[PDB]
């Protein structure tokens, strides 16, 4: 994160302010999801699951969201990728339409 110097005779001393993750939990990932035969990857996160649903979240602090088409992007049919998992990729356009 940062560092402050502090003088000392014939020398110098730093005080690094590092950042360290603390306590974790194991979850069941997967590389991708295809809602309509077309894959979906995370823009910056990773697909995880509390066991029942699915979410994407940043790689250093558990903070799930609902999979919208705005943190995901498509790269073609969903037959060639490994470990994909059938699910839905909820979209915000239709519910906000009405």
């Amino acid at each position: 994160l940062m560092s402050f110097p502090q003088s000392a005779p014939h020398g110098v001393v730093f005080l690094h302010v590092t950042y360290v993750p603390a306590q974790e939990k194991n979850f069941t990932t997967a590389p991708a999801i295809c809602h309509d035969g077309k894959a979906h990857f995370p823009r910056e996160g990773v697909f995880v699951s509390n066991g029942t649903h699915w979410f994407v979240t940043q790689r250093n602090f558990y903070e799930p969201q609902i999979i919208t088409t705005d943190n995901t992007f498509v790269s073609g049919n969903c037959d060639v990728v490994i470990g994909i998992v059938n699910n839905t990729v909820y979209d915000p356009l239709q519910p906000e339409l009405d």
């Binding site: 360290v20 993750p21 603390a22 974790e24 194991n26 990932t29 590389p31 991708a32 894959a39 990857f41 990773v46 790689r59 790269s75 073609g76 060639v80 990728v81 490994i82 470990g83």
Partner: protein, 100 residues
């Protein structure tokens, strides 16, 4: 040669670490890398499937993941062949160990 050296006080204080220990160190490092990505250098290791960690390293150099998740097999083949070539280049009398 060796005993001749010993024959005038010249000794060889043996190393503190024994090559078996060092080999175990490198094994530990290698397992840590191939299982925990780059995390364990910053606390406790975190298991994470390999392919996903590879895709992360690809995003590292500005290459979106789909290239990896669509060329995985080819990647594996290329890497294995490269390892074999290393085996050859070292096993062969071609000596990179001048620096030692």
């Amino acid at each position: 040669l060796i005993c001749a050296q010993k024959f005038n006080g010249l000794t060889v204080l043996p190393p503190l670490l024994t090559d078996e220990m060092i080999a175990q160190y490198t094994s530990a490092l290698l397992a840590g890398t191939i299982t925990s990505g780059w995390t364990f250098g910053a606390g406790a290791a975190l298991q994470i499937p390999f392919a996903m960690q590879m895709a992360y390293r690809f995003n590292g150099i500005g290459v979106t993941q789909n290239v990896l998740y669509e060329n995985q097999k080819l990647i594996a083949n290329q890497f294995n062949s490269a390892i074999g070539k290393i085996q050859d280049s070292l096993s062969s009398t071609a000596s990179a160990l001048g620096k030692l």
